[PDB]
Every structure is written in C-alpha cells, then in structure tokens.
Design an enzyme around this catalytic site. Structure first.
Site, short mmCIF file in Angstrom:
data_model
loop_
_atom_site.label_atom_id
_atom_site.label_comp_id
_atom_site.label_asym_id
_atom_site.label_seq_id
_atom_site.Cartn_x
_atom_site.Cartn_y
_atom_site.Cartn_z
N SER A 129 30.81 108.76 24.68
CA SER A 129 31.83 109.30 23.80
C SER A 129 32.77 108.22 23.28
CB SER A 129 32.63 110.40 24.53
OG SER A 129 33.13 111.35 23.61
N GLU B 287 37.83 109.11 13.85
CA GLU B 287 38.53 109.02 15.13
C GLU B 287 39.80 108.16 14.99
OE1 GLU B 287 37.74 110.56 17.71
OE2 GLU B 287 35.60 111.06 17.81
N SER C 295 36.65 116.89 23.86
CA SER C 295 37.96 117.37 24.20
C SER C 295 38.98 116.92 23.18
CB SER C 295 38.36 116.91 25.61
OG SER C 295 38.39 115.51 25.69
N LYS D 108 29.98 113.98 17.28
CA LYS D 108 29.32 112.69 17.40
C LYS D 108 27.78 112.83 17.33
CE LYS D 108 33.29 110.50 19.67
NZ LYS D 108 34.07 110.40 20.92
N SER E 10 34.73 115.72 20.05
CA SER E 10 33.67 114.74 20.23
C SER E 10 32.24 115.33 20.12
CB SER E 10 33.80 114.01 21.60
OG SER E 10 34.87 113.04 21.60
#
Ligand SMILES: *[B]([O])([O])C1=[C]C2=C([C]=[C][C]=[C]2)S1
Length: 261
Positions: free
Chosen positions: A103, A139, A210, A46, A43
């Site tokens: 996130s 994602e 993570s 991002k 993440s």
C-alpha cells in the site's frame, strides 16, 4: 436470523455504514448489503491503477521493466518501499507490487503519473464495463472520504464485479491476470480484515484501504479448498472525521456472509 438481519445488526451496533458484496462464482449468486451505495475507495483503488499498467503491458513487452527514478521530492506520506529507493530507481513492476502488497503511496502516485493522471485510471475502468468507479485525486488526498463526497468512490457491487473480471474473468490476458493474482495473494496488510473472518486454510488475495471518517475497506478473492472462488468486497465508514478504523468489523462481516461454505 437471516444473513440480512445479521449484517443490519452488525452495522447498527457499529454505529457506521457498512457495504458488502459477495459473489459466489459457482452459480453467480450474490449476497448484497447496501451494495449500490457509493463508498470512498481509499487504498483499494490501487488495484485499478496496477491493473491499468498490466493492461498496457499486454501490447508492450518492455514496459514492466521500464525503470522510474525515485527522488526525495517524490515521497508523500507513507512510502514503506519507495523510501528504500530514493536516488535509485524502481521498475513499473516493482511499483505495482509495492503499491498493492504494501500500500505504498509514492508507488501509487508514480503509477498514476505514468498513466497520465487520475482520469486515465477512470477510462481504464470504463473500458472494463465498470461505469461506477471514479478516481479523481492522487495520494494522499484521495483518502479524505467525506460523507456524500462522490470523488474517488465506487459501490461494493461495482467493485465486486470488476475485481472478479480482473482476477478470474476476461479483463486481462492470462500472463497479466496471473501477475495481478500473485500480487494480491502476497498482500501483507490484510491479516486483521477479511482474512480474519475466514477458515485459516483458505487462500485469499486482498487489498485493504483506510482513510478519514474511520473508513475501513478490504476487497478480496477467496479460493476455498473444495469449492469455486468467492469474490468479497466489504466497505465501512463512520460519521465522525476522526473515528477509529475498524478492521474487526470487516472480519465480522466476512464471517457472517461466508457461514455456509
Ligand atoms: B491506504 O491503505 O488506504 C493508505 C492510506 C494512507 C496511508 C498512509 C498515510 C496516509 C494515508 S496507507
């Protein structure tokens, strides 16, 4: 024991692979540990997608307010903000915010789609002089973090240099630079990570990440009370796919490398 010895000992006991890059912007000195090695970003990528949209907004004044439709089918896995807007809309600014502060995975995917795919995020990073960063997937699969897989990885030093340029340097015009900084400082997910290894009064903007293989990351800009900012990236990953994530190791690493400021 040196800072190098302490990280090595931390890494050994942890049983994983630790990557750290600290830049002290006062004198551009660096504390590096495995900093040229690739790690899965998870993440933390991002920030690059949000930054790419901000860059676009420098030449297009209506852009951040552009509305995007959120439908039930857009939803992937973990959508804390986007699920609140199914059948409605979110502006590109709201998506930037949700992706970074929460996130949100749907928000990330929306931003990538708007840009034209993972390869455009990669091109934006190159335009910043970052030759390491690569985003390959959307994602949630960009989080597989398979050892030795180069997809969706960067190195701690490359990511430290790039985060420095974005928040404190020349990457974005001032209004957009300040927006990115506001987003990072309002992050809600990083209390147990880098922030936990620092004096409580320091101001931090960070983005956690993570993924599989117990991959546990955080990248942070830090403003001490009476010193120039520090930029700190801590990446950590483990050899078994189902390993537990270890935010405490990043906190332990942040405490080690900032002992002296
Ligand atoms: B990010 O912080 O690395 C995230 C990745 C996933 C989340 C939720 C579900 C699956 C992956 S948040």
């Amino acid at each position: 024991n040196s800072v190098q010895q302490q990280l090595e000992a931390l890494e050994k006991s942890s049983g994983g692979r630790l990557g750290v890059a600290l830049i002290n912007t006062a004198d551009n000195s660096q504390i590096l540990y495995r900093a040229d090695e690739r790690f899965a970003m998870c993440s933390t990528s991002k920030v690059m997608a949000a930054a790419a949209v901000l860059k676009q907004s420098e030449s297009d004044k209506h852009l951040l307010n552009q509305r995007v439709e959120i439908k039930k089918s857009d939803l992937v896995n973990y959508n804390p903000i986007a699920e609140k807007h199914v059948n409605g809309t979110m502006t590109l600014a709201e998506l930037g915010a949700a992706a970074l502060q929460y996130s949100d995975n749907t928000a990330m995917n929306k931003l990538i789609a708007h840009l034209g795919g993972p390869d455009k995020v990669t091109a934006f990073a190159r335009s910043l002089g970052d030759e390491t960063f690569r985003l390959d997937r959307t994602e949630p699969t960009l989080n597989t973090a398979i050892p030795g897989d180069p997809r969706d990885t960067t190195t701690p030093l490359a990511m430290a240099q790039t985060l420095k340029n974005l928040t404190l340097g020349k990457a974005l015009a001032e209004t957009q630079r300040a927006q990115l900084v506001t987003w990072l400082k309002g992050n809600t997910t990083g209390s147990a990570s880098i922030r936990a290894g620092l004096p409580k009064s320091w101001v931090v903007g960070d983005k956690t990440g993570s993924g599989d293989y117990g991959t546990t990351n955080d990248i942070a800009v830090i403003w001490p009370e009476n010193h120039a900012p520090l930029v700190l990236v801590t990446y950590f990953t483990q050899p078994e796919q189902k390993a537990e994530n270890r935010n405490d190791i990043l906190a332990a690493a942040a405490k080690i490398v900032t002992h002296g400021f």
